Amino acid sequence: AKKVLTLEGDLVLGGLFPVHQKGGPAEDCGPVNEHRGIQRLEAMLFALDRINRDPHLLPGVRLGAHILDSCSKDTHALEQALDFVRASLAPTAITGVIGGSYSDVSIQVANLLRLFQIPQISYASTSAKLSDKSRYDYFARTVPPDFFQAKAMAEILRFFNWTYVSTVASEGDYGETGIEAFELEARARNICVATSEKVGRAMSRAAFEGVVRALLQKPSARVAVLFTRSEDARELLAASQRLNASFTWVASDGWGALESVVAGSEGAAEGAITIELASYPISDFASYFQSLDPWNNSRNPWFREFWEQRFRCSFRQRDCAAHSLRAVPFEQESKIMFVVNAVYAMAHALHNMHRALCPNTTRLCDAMRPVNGRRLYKDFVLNVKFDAPFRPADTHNEVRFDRFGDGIGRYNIFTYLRAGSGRYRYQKVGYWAEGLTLDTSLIPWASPSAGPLPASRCSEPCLQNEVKSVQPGEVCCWLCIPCQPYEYRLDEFTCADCGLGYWPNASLTGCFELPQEYIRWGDAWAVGPVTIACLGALATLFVLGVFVRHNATPVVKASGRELCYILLGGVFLCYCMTFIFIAKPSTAVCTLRRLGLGTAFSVCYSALLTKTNRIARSPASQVAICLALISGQLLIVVAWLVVEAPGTGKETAPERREVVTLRCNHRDASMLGSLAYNVLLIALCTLYAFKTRKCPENFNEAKFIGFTMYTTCIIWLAFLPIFYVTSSDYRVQTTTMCVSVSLSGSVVLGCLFAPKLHIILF
Amino acid sequence: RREIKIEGDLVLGGLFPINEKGTGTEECGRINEDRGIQRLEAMLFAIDEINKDDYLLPGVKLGVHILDTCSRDTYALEQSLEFVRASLTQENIPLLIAGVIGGSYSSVSIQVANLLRLFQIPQISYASTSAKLSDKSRYDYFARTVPPDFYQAKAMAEILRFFNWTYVSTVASEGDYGETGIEAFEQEARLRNICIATAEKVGRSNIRKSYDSVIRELLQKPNARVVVLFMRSDDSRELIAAASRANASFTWVASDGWGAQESIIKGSEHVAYGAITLELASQPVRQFDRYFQSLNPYNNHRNPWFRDFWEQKFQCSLQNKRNHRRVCDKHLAIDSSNYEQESKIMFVVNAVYAMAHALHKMQRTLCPNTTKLCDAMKILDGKKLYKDYLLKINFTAPFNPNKDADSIVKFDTFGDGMGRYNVFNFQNVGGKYSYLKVGHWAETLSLDVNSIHWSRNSVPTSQCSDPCAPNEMKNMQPGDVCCWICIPCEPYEYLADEFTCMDCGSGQWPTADLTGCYDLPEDYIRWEDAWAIGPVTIACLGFMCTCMVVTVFIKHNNTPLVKASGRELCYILLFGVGLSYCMTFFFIAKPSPVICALRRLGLGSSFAICYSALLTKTNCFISPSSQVFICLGLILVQIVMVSVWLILEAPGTRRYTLAEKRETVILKCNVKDSSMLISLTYDVILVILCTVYAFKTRKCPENFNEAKFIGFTMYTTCIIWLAFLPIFYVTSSDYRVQTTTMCISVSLSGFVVLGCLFAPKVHII
Ligand SMILES: N[C@](CC1c2ccccc2Oc2ccccc21)(C(=O)O)[C@H]1C[C@@H]1C(=O)O
Ligand SMILES: N[C@](CC1c2ccccc2Oc2ccccc21)(C(=O)O)[C@H]1C[C@@H]1C(=O)O
Ligand SMILES: *[C@@H]1O[C@H](CO)[C@@H](O)[C@H](O)[C@H]1NC(C)=O
Ligand SMILES: *[C@@H]1O[C@H](CO)[C@@H](O)[C@H](O)[C@H]1NC(C)=O
Known part of the structure; x- marks a missing residue:
């Protein structure tokens, strides 16, 4: 139940196409693919025919073909691929296969053919795990891998300054690796992901409503990065429409420019920015495919089944007569270009090897009969920089393979916009080929208006006045809360508690002290x-003349x-402490001031x-008592001042209260008690x-x-x-x-x- | 070509290197008598015992499908396709292969395992010790009854720790063996308090002049007296002989390649004195002794390579058709005089019994009522057989009933056998030089120190490692990466770091090593003097x-x-x-x-x-x-x-x-x-x-x-x-x-x- 297309030539090129769709448990493979298998197989045949008729590409060497059907299954592909190895060990040996449309099929074929040194060039496999050479030594692909679109979307988000975005993933193989790739690229571009979640195929409408609600949990995340399949994206758009939620979707090749995703959900899909693989139709291939009928096409064994399935007739009857491909519309597969490019790259590598091995002859070389995958692959497959065949005129497209043996990443930026008449269309507004180029003039929301959907961040950066170190749970949300004047910030992470009085002079570093305070008033209160x-002073002058004539006066x-x-002297001492109090207190002024009033109450x-x-009742006894009392009063003064250490520097209220360093650090509580004890004794003596x-x-x-x-x-x-x-x-x-001491002095x-003195004077 | 295709209900594949690899027109030449023929008969002997067994597969007969790999990885792939032909949906009817008991070479096993995993065919190896095969991401249907090579690195590190050998020198060899194991030794060495002194590489394509420089560069480090050798059998022999010419005396710690072999010490028994070597703990199979000796070309028709083995071993031709060889005598036979059991014979028998035990357990679960093959066994899924049954086996050695406690056959998570290594010691009994087992390494270290002489002395190699008398010694030294001979500090300076002794406080006395960072106290004048x-x-x-x-x-x-x-x-x-x-x-x-x-x-x-x-x-x-x-x-x-x-x-x-x-x-x-x-x-x-x-x-x-x-x-x-x-x-x-x-x-x-x-x-x- 297997068919093979076997052409004859000096060099045979293998092929693997998904001609038949998956059958399941009932059959190995059932319906015939009309676009992925048949069109690509015909494209490979057309490319081979063109190469065989090209005098500048293998003029003497004729390229054969050995094309098999994988039936869109990895096990069937593995079983079918055990035909090239048998030829390598009437089988015809090949120089390499050009096949593999599915990622699993390509992986299995590369695993099988690596051990036998058979280079493989793929045309549709975009798996990100096929790029490492640790497991696939002889694998190449013309299509770019799937992590290039991730960095393309990251650059798109960076261009529009959409730092705060939310990503939606898929449960299958396509839907994860792109998400980790986009997350890795976002961190390198200062892009943060708000919400990350997975969506499964078996999920019902309830799960889609729940994930939409979860997306809505962040009002500041108005941009959604979708990396899913077509069905998942369509279901998500339908769920968003039913809930009537607005978003700026950014999508990968899964959405692209397909109209089935927006089928019935055009209202909620407006403004979406989707990216699709860039390719162009081939007029020559279209002409070749249109002029194809079962009568004049015997090379293809599956052409009869394709004719039966597309044109619904049968060959047991005579209905399949009038139907032709020219009359019915023909839609060229988007990856025909990649198939042609892979075939031409293999042909060019073979031609380069033939030229290098022996330039003398143009026919198959004597030493080229043993074909090795190692040398051919490494020396010629990787190093191809040939012009793209059937390319249009005003374009520069080259077919090259990088050091991972992958294709060149060229994507088209598409947007979903509403026309004036109301029609919805996908129109290209840019491209990504090792660089992001957007016109920003054709996007409907790029026009000058009240904000082109700014998804800046969870909070605006706030560095002018307030401190922005506070976070609500997400490190990416960047909000500020002002600190009190008592808490001047000395760092970007916290507000220091040095105090509002020591305001830095536009420095915010170290809490520079402010000398302004109530230290000494030169003219504010010194009057x-x-x-x-x-x-x-006048009293002292009068006292000097008072006792001058005291001896003369009998009284x-x-x-x-x-x-x-x-x-x-005691009255003179009263104003002696007056100016000391007025003067600036310090570690020595206050101590002298403290002793100033201590002896003032003693005299x-x-x-x-x-x-x-004198009233009770001699000069020797009187002077002895007063001296002892003065000594006794000063005896406790010296002992009291050493109890507490004096110093300078006092704290006060914030906001420049101007009460800093008002008095020295020596406590005045003991001074009040000392003067109160002697006051009672003086009062008792007076009584x-x-x-x-x-x-x-x-x-x-x-x-x-x-x-x-x-x-x-x-x-x-x-x-x-x-x-x-x-x-x-x-x-x-x-x-x-x-004024208190002066009143006592007065x-x-x-x-x-x-x-x-008045009696003596008068 | 030649192959064995004995029929049975279940057929087990086999890959043995009967023919040695060659060059030129002949792809493979001489017959490998020890690793190719004796191992081949071990699989046949075990399967015959299994078939005669009444408790292991009583109603299922085990067939064979054995191919010669010719000791080539590329040639093994060509015959590996025969194992998958029967798995694809009349001159030669393909036989379904339940599993492949093959290998004997890391290159052969690696290539074969790559092809077998794509078709879900379990593979058990008996002599492959490559560390690359332990990666389940690339080999997810591979198993082996022998421990991997890097298990020896763990064994060697423990010997150094037991003897307090810290400053050690490592010598490797080019290829795939030396680099892989010597790489894994460093992490095991750095896991303990051991740093490598010198790293060396030895090549096959060089002259004895380069071997002298290998020895000489080892002498320009007096401290290093123990050398961790992870070389090959031929490479280590020349290096030891090179040390004799240079008049060297080192203690050698060696892995497999230098075990109890008597072909390395030859002519250089002086410097090799006191060396410690490791070898796989393999016991002789007594039942296999009578089976192999009783084999004759006239009655052993199952083996197609027996005629070549008999002719090559005895240098005689059975049918001398004008050839330059003598006619084999009818009474010629092999006896214990010229028969020596191959080292890994018991691993071949264990591998065969491991697959049979896994199939027996699977058969009972799928077919509890009957003891014969069922329709559910026709598909014979290899994913369930390997992951669920093969990796969960636990049985004693069939032919070792003396030490069943520590001879259990089982596979770990990575599908590798238990690591049981023997520790030997080259010693002089007096007038004779021979090896002697001085311990074993089965998940733990156990040595017999009293029987170890010339290494009973601690032979310190820690002149760098840690002399470090507790005078706040600092571990550093200029020019040397990890010598750190503890000199660069003084007891007056407090110890605060390793590279720098980091004195804290001028004129301060440390308490023990660090706490004396406070300033020294002072005494003022005494009052009331x-x-x-x-x-x-x-x-x-x-x-x-x-x-x-x-x-x-x-x-x-x-x-x-x-x-x-x-x-x-x-x-x-x-x-x-x-x-x-x-x-x-x-x-x-x-x-x-x-x-x-x-x-x-x-x-x-x-x-x-x-x-x-x-x-x-x-x-x-x-x-x-x-x-x-x-x-x-x-x-x-x-x-x-x-x-x-x-x-x-x-x-x-x-x-x-x-x-x-x-x-x-x-x-x-x-x-x-x-x-x-x-x-x-x-x-x-x-x-x-x-x-x-x-x-x-x-x-x-x-x-x-x-x-x-x-x-x-x-x-x-x-x-x-x-x-x-x-x-x-x-x-x-x-x-x-x-x-x-x-x-x-x-x-x-x-x-x-x-x-x-x-x-x-x-x-x-
Ligand atoms: N190019 C694809 C990409 C493919 C894919 C593309 C879109 C959505 C889902 C999805 O499934 C996965 C999963 C993993 C890797 C690749 C894919 C390939 O097979 O590599 C596939 C379109 C090509 C084809 O089958 O013709
Ligand atoms: N067990 C071995 C070990 C082998 C080896 C042993 C000693 C010296 C060099 C050397 O080369 C390498 C290189 C990498 C891995 C393993 C080895 C195997 O091939 O796996 C091989 C003895 C087994 C046999 O051939 O019967
Ligand atoms: C994004 O920010 C940059 C400045 O960093 C600005 O030049 C650019 O115009 C912004 N993009 C917009 C507003 O789309
Ligand atoms: C190794 O050192 C430890 C302590 O460091 C000691 O107990 C042991 O006996 C030593 N082993 C020897 C010297 O073999």
Whole structure:
């Protein structure tokens, strides 16, 4: 139940075509293919006849033919291919086969013929696994492999800046390897895949609706990359139409320019960008095939079956008489060009070998009788750069094989557009031949409008102000969220928590410190402090002249002279700490300032104690008590300051609160307690003085001393509530501190010493 | 051609190299007696036993279809097509082949397996050990009862690990054998803590001159004493003989190719002494001994190559038709005198039984009711037979009932037999050189060390690997890739990395190897020392003496009313003496965070107070009072710039010393030593100048004692200044200079107060 087309010649070329379709369990193979097998077989026969009549291609060597039928099955192809090897071991030896239309058939034939050194040139096998030479040492193909269209689609997406796309795959062999190839090419072109899924042949409409809904889960992915078969693409388009979803489909050769995929689904297929293999019709082959009838065609054994199947008649009757191929329309197969190219490439390789082995004779060479696949293949099959036969005029097409023995990738870019009259057509808008060239002027959505379907990304790049390191689960989605002013970012991945006060000067690196803060006011608030200092300076000058005539004055002479000097110095010390507080605090200024008011309360407390001694009751004892009290007050001062280490640098509120380094690091909590303890003792001493009934003696001085102590106690009891009330505004706290000490200094001059000087002066 | 076509219910294919490969007109020539004929009869002997067996295929008869490969891969393909003719849908009726028991050559098996996989014909090999056949992507219907070649690489690596041989040298051979196995050895070597020293290649087409250079380049590495040989039988023989000419002595670790063969050690038994070699663990088949010997050309008609084998072996012709050969005697026979069993005979029998066991299991599952061939066996699918049944066999050796525990025949996932290798050792018993088994490798390492001599000594090769005494040794060495002889570091430097010893911290002592990255500690001056208690008591005694003078001075200040200003002069002088005495109290304390900052202020104030009192006395009611006020202001003015010197850095910046071991530094006061001595020296120069002028003048009205006291104290200040500066200028000791100044200061304070208080002491007493 097998037929063979066996022509005779010096060199015989094998052939393998899918003349019969798959039969199944019922029969080995049933219906006869009218386009994939018959047309391609006739194209090979026509090419062989043209070569045999070409004086410039094997003028003396006649090319034979040994064509078998694989019945579109790999096992049948393997069984049929065991006819070339038997001839190599009345069989006629061959120089190589030109056959293989299906990927599995070609793989099996290459596996069988590799062991016997038989080169094979394919015309339709685009399998991506036939390119590696580790398993197919003698395989070549004129058609490009299936991973070239993957990078073509990747370049198409890159050209339109469609980074965020979703890919739909197929369960079969065609539908996977292209998807991994496209994924590999996309990562090298900064293209991300949003959703990846597989579609099976047995899936019903529910599965297609589910996959459409899954595609719709990403609103930002308006471009769908389809790498599937014709039936799967048609079902997907129908499902999209039923759900009424809009997409910008990018499809491989599976869709191409076929009108059956868009049959009844033209609404949802608008704007699709599909790619198809580029080929041209052959007028000579069409003329040869049209003038073919069973009566004048005896070489082909399957021609009678093809005539019966195409023209529905029979030869047992006489109906197959009027029917002719010329009258009926004839559609040339798109891969006839590839079959002719493969046959001519094999013929050219044979001619080159014949010329190289012996240029003396044009007939079959004496040393060429043993034909080896290794040398012939490697030295001539790979190195062919001949002109394409039957090529049109205004085109430059060459037939060459690369270092994987594959064809040249040339694809046509097609788009689905609506015409003015409403007709839907596929029109070429570019091509891909080792480079992407699109006019971008004939695509319906390429016209200037409100966005040519921008599938930019999940989120717009955001680098001007905000930080773009936050992701929602996908590394490709690239969105920003602004950080608070307290969190200035020092890197592209996070926002540093250095603080808003240390704003970098358009640097965003290292959080450069801002020296501006409340350190010292030269003229903002120093005017008030100057008045207190000026008043204290005037008091010191008056005190210098007050004690100059103290010895002459009997009233001053009667009172203690040693204690009078420290009273002027104590009042002078009141404004001594005034300008220290106003000055800029530091590791030494604040410590000196802290000791400034520590001894300020000691001299006033000692003055009250000495005053009570005179009322109760000598100069040697009085100076000893005050010195001991001053030493005792300073005894705890030195011990308290070493408890806490002083320093510089204070933190405050963000957004340039201007409160940085307001005060030194030394804690002032202990200072408040130290002055409060001595205040009570001073108040108790003043109360004890009022208890004594020595009013008749020294009435003028006692009344002034008592009034001064009462005012100081009242003032001191009033400062405490306002310190806790504010709890902030260090500039205001410094301002109210300067006026506090000055008020104590002002009333110090108004003590009992003042009336004594007035009486002496007057 | 010739072939065996014994009929049966099931036919098993066979590929044996009966004829040796040739060149020229003849494609294959001489008959292979050992690998071609003896192995061929092993398959026939096993199948005859299987047919006679009652438990293995009782109702199924196993046929044969055996072809001669002629030891050629291309010629094997031509006859491999006969195995697939019956699988395609009357001179010679094709016979269906259940499986092919063939191979014996990696090139033959690789080519045959490529053709058989396309037709789903299972293949079991008996002598193919190529590592390429383990790739199921290209050979998915191939199996073998022998372990692959790269299993020996794992075996050799374990021997090196057992003997701690790390720095090893590898020698390979050209072709397909040497490169493949020596490549797989490196990953196994790098898996353990072993790095390769030298990689070498040996070619067939070369002269003995190149062999010498192979030996010579091995000697220019004294450490490497063990050489991993993965050469061939002929290649290794010349290399060992080359070492004898060069007078070399190495320990050889060798794979298959050099096992227990007696054709390599010949003429070069000296250098080969102590070598360790591996060989496949194959046991003799006792039942095969009687079968082969009882074979004669007159009754063995199944073998068509037996006539050629008989003629070639005995150099006789059965039918001498005017030929130059003797007529074979009728009584000629083969006996144990000239019969030696081929090494891989038991693998041929195992391969045949493996296929028969797989078919028997498949038959029972498909045909449980009957014991004969069924219609379901007519298709005879090879995918189910190989993947489901052939790869899942588990049975003991049919003809080895002594060690059935470790002689189980089974195939792993990749369809390879279990790896059981024997470990031999070339040794000298005394007057004789022979091999001796010294262990075995069956999924584990087991060696008999006591029987291993000339290798019982550890013979270290780790002069590079890891001498590494635990003095923070660093594994590196310039020029050498992985020697790392551990020299390039020192125990003082802490170990932090391998290539660089990576010392962390200058002058630091590591704890064990790394943890000593912290800086070395330092010790400051010891407080409450013996040298400090003395001055402390002296200062306390001096302060008490001055305090007693103060109490006497105030008590005796009533009657002498004439000296109104004398009490004021005594009071300030007493305060200066007390301040000077109190300086020693805190100056000798070792912890001085801010103590030294106040020490210079106190020392300056004490000097200023003493200078002011001396100046006032030299110059001398209202007028004396003004002088005291001026003198008091001068002391305050003398302290105005005292704090200015400390207004920049009172604690100092840092303190260091020349010695890096003691580091006896304060670590809290780093003031400028030169500035401190300059200020102290300048504070006493003016005092001496002012006192010299007063000494020259004569003070008649009761001031002679004051003038004499001023002049007496002038020399004390000059002596102290001229002695305190030189000792602290150069030595700059931690404590020795400090205590010397303290003794000088207290002595000066006692001297000045003694002169001033001398007159009141006499008056009081
Ligand atoms: N050129 C094809 C490509 C083919 C294919 C093309 C589109 C959709 C599905 C599909 O199935 C697979 C699967 C794997 C590899 C290749 C394909 C070849 O067989 O190689 C085939 C059209 C050629 C022919 O049969 O004439
Ligand atoms: N088992 C062998 C091993 C063989 C081999 C053995 C030792 C030295 C060189 C060498 O050449 C290679 C090269 C690659 C793989 C295997 C080998 C096989 O052919 O597989 C062969 C002994 C078996 C037989 O011929 O009976
Ligand atoms: C894609 O982006 C590039 C800039 O990177 C731009 O020049 C080009 O016009 C864009 N393509 C479009 C808008 O189709
Ligand atoms: C190898 O070294 C290990 C420890 O490193 C030791 O226990 C063993 O005995 C050594 N083997 C020898 C010296 O054969």
